[PDB]
Amino acid sequence: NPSLIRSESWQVYEGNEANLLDGDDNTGVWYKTLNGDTSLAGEFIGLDLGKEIKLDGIRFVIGKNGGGSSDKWNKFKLEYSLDNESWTTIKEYDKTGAPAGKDVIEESFETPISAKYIRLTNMENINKWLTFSEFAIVS
Ligand SMILES: [Ca+2]
Ligand code: NA
Structure with a gap:
């Protein structure tokens, strides 16, 4: 079972990382960012898959209802790694002006991608x- 990886400096303000x-798309977490309420480039959240596996896709839900x-x-960007040191991007996103609330980031790979870590x-x-709100893989 995947476990969560994210930037260590964030504070859990509301919710539970589980x-x-x-x-469930309807359960999430609200993180307080430090550095003057700023998420700096390079910060991240995603999954440690435990072992290298072939991924057919991912489904990540950013945002949540109500507060935040x-x-x-x-x-x-969506990126993956085999060793938690070198990363390879799959997709870059620009969601400026996206609607408030949950946003489903879902991708399918025609040829599987072998990854041990995968994150935004x-x-x-x-x-x-x-x-x-949610981080899942399809494999
Ligand atoms: Ca959830
Ligand atoms: Na919502």
Whole structure:
């Protein structure tokens, strides 16, 4: 079973990090970001898969309902790794002006991608806290 990896400096403001793996879009977490309420480029959240596996896709739900519904990155990338040291990007996203609330980031790979770690990583400083709801893989 995957476990959560995320930037260590974030504070859990509301929710429980187990909510990010419970298979329910409707349960999430609200993180307070330090550095003057700023998520710096390079910060991240995703999954340690435990072992290298072939992924057919991912389904990550960023944001959450209510409090912190707009507390989301605007530019971020999906990337994977075999060793937690070198990363390879799969997709870059620009969600500036996306609707408030949950946003389903879902990708399918025609040819599986072998990964031990897979995560979303901020590409650009943003002066916001952050909410998330779910991280899942398809394999
Ligand atoms: Ca959840
Ligand atoms: Na919502």
